[PDB]
Design a protein around this ligand. Sequence first.
Ligand SMILES: OC[C@@H]1O[C@@](O)(CO)[C@H](O)[C@H]1O
Length: 300
Amino acid sequence: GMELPSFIFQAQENLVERPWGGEWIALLKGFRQSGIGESWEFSAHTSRPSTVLVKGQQLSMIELFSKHRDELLGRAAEKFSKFPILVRLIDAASPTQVHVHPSDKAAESLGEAEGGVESAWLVFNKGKAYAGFKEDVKIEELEEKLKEEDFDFKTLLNTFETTPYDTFVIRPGIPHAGEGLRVLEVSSNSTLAYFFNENDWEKVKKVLNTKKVEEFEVKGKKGMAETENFGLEVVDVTGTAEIKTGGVMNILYAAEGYFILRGKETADLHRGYSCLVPASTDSFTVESERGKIVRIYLKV
Ligand SMILES: OC[C@@H]1O[C@@](O)(CO)[C@H](O)[C@H]1O
């Protein structure tokens, strides 16, 4: 199967308004607007599917995947029967509340319609990431804190003062939050998240890792992180660089600079935008005066 072009673009922006969102995302997408917390890039999530342009014609990621699944996934086609990932730009400008994701096992046990969530984070600025308890805690003592008006639960977590392109891997059960933080978050194709509040507390108790987590357990390498199912890497481009898909679906995000893309056809990519590369493209070149492009890939 090789019906698809090398480079598939979103037809329209897929943005999410959030009270904690600032101005960064709208600005990436060429306009001025506060209160945008998220941009969903090539979402095949049923709550919020992206729409794409294939050779100039418009369709949903969901349609695209049901029709072109084997070609899109390539060597990952046997491993994944549903669309494997969700890619989001996140502008956590105001502090988010502490939350936690279930594993596949926990989500199934809780009877959720969605699966578990693992995620890899690529940070773009100097902000604060919070991940894992810095000491052992007791569920009961966390519940005492819920009684207070607005106990800062982030004070109980490892605090990371970031620099651009720091990475994190947030595993199921790990409590986390961000503040003044611009981030690319590649996760499972699931949005299950339980916040530290009365409404979600019964779910939190069932999935929360209450043990001390060491910093090395949540920190990735500079510009590079992976789970067992997917990964991301920052490619520094000065001039022309050849990029290999590995015969699996890739997504490219232009973090800095302007790129000319040359595969089966020629295209370009502006800072703030993403490109979907089907597995049927073995390799292609990207060209930039000096830029940084993020390659997101499936692991098989
Ligand atoms: O000061 C902001 C407050 O702190 C928190 O992060 C608590 O963990 C909440 O998001 C917000 O209510």
